Design a protein around this nucleic acid. Structure first.
Lengths: 271, 46
RNA sequence: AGGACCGAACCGACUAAUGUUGAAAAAUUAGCGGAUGACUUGUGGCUGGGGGUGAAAGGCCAAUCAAACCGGGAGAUAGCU
RNA sequence: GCUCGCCGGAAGACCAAGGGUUCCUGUCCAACGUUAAUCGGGGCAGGGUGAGUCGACCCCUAAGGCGAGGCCGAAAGGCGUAGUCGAUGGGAAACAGGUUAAUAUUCCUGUACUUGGUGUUACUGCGAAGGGGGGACGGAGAAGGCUAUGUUGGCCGGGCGACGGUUGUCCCGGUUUAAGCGUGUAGGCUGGUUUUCCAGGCAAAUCCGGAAAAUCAAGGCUGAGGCGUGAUGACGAGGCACUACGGUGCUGAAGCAACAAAUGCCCUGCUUCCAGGAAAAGCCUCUAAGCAUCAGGUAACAUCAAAUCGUACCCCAAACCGACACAGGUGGUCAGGUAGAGAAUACCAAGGCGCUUGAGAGAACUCGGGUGAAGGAACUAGGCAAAAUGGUGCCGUAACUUCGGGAGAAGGCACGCUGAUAUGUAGGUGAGGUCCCUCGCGGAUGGAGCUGAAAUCAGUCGAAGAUACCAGCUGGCUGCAACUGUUUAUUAAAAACACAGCACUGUGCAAACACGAAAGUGGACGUAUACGGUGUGACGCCUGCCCGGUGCCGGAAGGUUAAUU
RNA sequence: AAUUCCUUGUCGGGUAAGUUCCGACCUGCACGAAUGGCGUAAUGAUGGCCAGGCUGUCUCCACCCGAGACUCAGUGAAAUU
């Protein structure tokens, strides 16, 4: 749960952390590991395209079944392992046929529950089945926009999506950002919500905690010099412009979505 | 104090060697220019 | 346990004196700060100039930088000495 | 040659990188060496570097490079699949002693080990560009056994002291040995065996995984260290003979025990924490096609083979980087004694040095220091500088407070040596015997020896007992920044930047954005609890009012309005 | 106030004597609310002020110890003109 650390040191005064006792301790399943090198924000041209990225603790990638197409065979969850790659915990399932896989951890799941995937699977938190079958009005997660493409939306910890209507071959969902979006009705999804919901309440406390995760410091525009950034320099503290990006695009209000191809699927833009 | 030239034969060969120069056509142009000028040593080597 | 304390190696340069034709084209001497970390170091690799990088001083990019070095336009032009 | 002084977690020894004969011998002082120079890293001549086990080479691979085909681009070309390269990482094996002026895990002696080939022999399921296993991996913390090593006591060989004593609880020296081989210990890890099935591991599998039974309560894996062997060997203080006076030839006793103990080993171990900690090959196993007497595999024996390149010298400096024989810089390895917490510090050991101009004299003045009557900041922009405090144990310690702190606040007390407590106590260490058995590197007892803080009391010396070195000035009011941190290499380290936190804002994934004439790449193998941009910058109380101006957002069919017609 | 020209504003504290310091008045030339307002424990090689100890900073310098400066032998520059 959420725990505060007492102020023994200034770098420790404001530290608040979430500790889960149930998470398994020990090395993860080796056959599901693979190397993952960090880039530092530089593309194949060796040029920095994204800023504030670099350093951080070394990490290894873990293979997660975002498709869940292995239907007809039940499985038992063994443990809830910790994933440094993402924000949500990952459960290690074993199918009745001895095949081991990793999945996102739904809320309310403990070691021992049954799991089933398929068109005829039972309605319970975690089961996977296309919206041809889910009753209208429920909460799911790990949804996809194209069949067989794998889970694509609402994958961060603590999030979900709410289904509101099925019209013919298209259903309508209310995304976490508030958008009302159409989607093809033969896409599969997982019922329930993603676990580790209290991920919000952590407080980093000190800059070293952020740096452990590989994020470089950000330099304010208003203190810069004129030659590099439009917000420019000047004596004292002078701003006297309208806020703008480093490349000259005005911020604080300007829309940027210009994809006329997929505008047919949006029913209501977020408000 | 620590100053500019810190010798390293491997770096020297890989940055100014015969093969490194000739890998691209600019290096070929440099080699041709040195040959025309008639320099004693075309590039750094043993 | 601690971006916890005192303090060697290690890193840095706050004060004073000398030196400034210097043992040195930025030292030395006596003090000084950090010293399990946002730490420091070896080797190799990548980022090329109106560009790179920059916890951001117009700082660094081979003793140089409000636009590097070499070669060329080029015997630029000079109502000035 | 004798004496003196200095360094000695170095100014000692060995490498890496880098340099290339600077290494040794003979020979000369033309030029170089900040003076002489018979000397030299100088000049000339000659000599010197020996590898199946050490590195390179070689098998594999990360960051990354190149890249058939391919995509894209006026041309030149950019990116990338198959693939190939690329260590700073993974992969087999030699020890001790002796010799040159210059080489030595390379030459010699003795004792080893690894890999591959060939043949003989006996048995015989062999087979991969495929599947499994393993290789194969974070930080911090703790403590039991060890070892290096040192000290002491014995042992052996010497000695009786230039000046008071100095046959003994006196002084000096030594009291050493590897790899491999067997032993499998302290200790760590894991139940084992058999049978029967199975939508999985691209097919296949007896292999892995999963399921169901029966059976046993030990059974494997790992493992420092110790003992034996190696080793009747070598070495060995010395002594003996020549000293072509450098060295050479012989010979050569004792060669034990206790205690202490590493940052090294067990330990790639154990506990614990979140920031969740390379890859591939060698090695073991499964089968696919194929081959079956074969072929091939297995085990023993004998035999052959293990190519090439580097091996001199300096390597915290006179040889490297700095125009210099330059007070500067340069990664790793080993780490004695005394006191001490210490790799600090002062004096020494092994070892290495006195820094390539000297000799006189004792003006002003300058530089680095020592002391100083009385005053004690009166100096000055400013206590700049200098002066001053400084250790261990114990007692005692305010306001404020985010209850953590402040705080080592402040402040005070004891500190040497000798005797006794106690002929060396507490404590630690621990054999011989005794018994039992698992007869083993076994178990209980048992205390010999060995080592040994701290404290009390009594006495005693000095002016001075934390005597040297080493080793915080303290308090009060107050502006700024919450704090650790970063910055103008080379006049500015800060009230500047950053930071955790807060707010707005854009982005529904082929995301926004950014580098690219383009393919493409980052974002991100992430999916609104996420990502980008801007503003402020812990925490607490808060964050009035104004939409006229300028921007941004939502609508215009009212007006004006382009290419076209 | 790191604001404030007039201004060394006025009063109080501190000193024998205080344009600096602290606490108030308010007539804010020309503060003010996320280019943030007010306060804040702890922290700072940070700015300002005041005490005790300490002393050659000073009153006012005196003596001594070493390296130069002087002499002799040897080698043997430079700026400028």
């Amino acid at each position: 749960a959420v725990v505060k650390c007492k102020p023994t040191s200034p770098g420790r005064r404001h530290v608040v952390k979430v500790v889960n006792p149930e998470l398994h301790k020990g090395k993860p399943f080796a056959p599901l590991l693979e190397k993952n090198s960090k880039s530092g924000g530089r593309n194949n041209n060796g040029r920095i395209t994204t800023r504030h990225i670099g350093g951080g603790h070394k990490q290894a990638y873990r293979i997660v079944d975002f498709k869940r197409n292995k239907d007809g065979i039940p499985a038992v969850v063994e443990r809830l392992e910790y994933d440094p790659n993402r924000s949500a915990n990952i459960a290690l399932v074993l199918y009745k046929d001895g095949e081991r896989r990793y999945i996102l951890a739904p809320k309310g799941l403990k070691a021992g529950d049954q799991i089933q995937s398929g068109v005829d699977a039972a309605i319970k938190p975690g089961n996977t089945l296309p919206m041809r079958n889910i009753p209208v009005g429920s909460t799911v997660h790990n949804v996809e926009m194209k069949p067989g493409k794998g889970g694509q939306l609402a994958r961060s910890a603590g999030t979900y999506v709410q289904i509101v209507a099925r019209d013919g071959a298209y259903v309508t969902l209310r995304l976490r950002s508030g958008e009302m979006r159409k989607v093809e009705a033969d896409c599969r999804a997982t019922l329930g919500e993603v676990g580790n919901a209290e991920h919000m309440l952590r407080v980093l406390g000190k800059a070293g905690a952020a740096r452990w995760r590989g994020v470089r410091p950000t330099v304010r525009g208003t203190a810069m010099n004129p030659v590099d950034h439009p917000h420019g320099g000047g004596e004292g503290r002078n701003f006297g412009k309208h806020p703008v990006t480093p490349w000259g695009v005005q911020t604080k209000g300007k829309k940027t979505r210009s994809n006329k191809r997929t505008d047919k699927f949006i029913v209501r833009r977020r408000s | 104090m620590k100053r500019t030239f810190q010798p390293s034969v491997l770096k020297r060969n890989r940055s100014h060697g015969f093969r490194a120069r000739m890998a691209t056509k600019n290096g070929r142009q440099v080699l041709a220019r040195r040959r025309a000028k008639g320099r004693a040593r075309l590039t750094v080597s043993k």
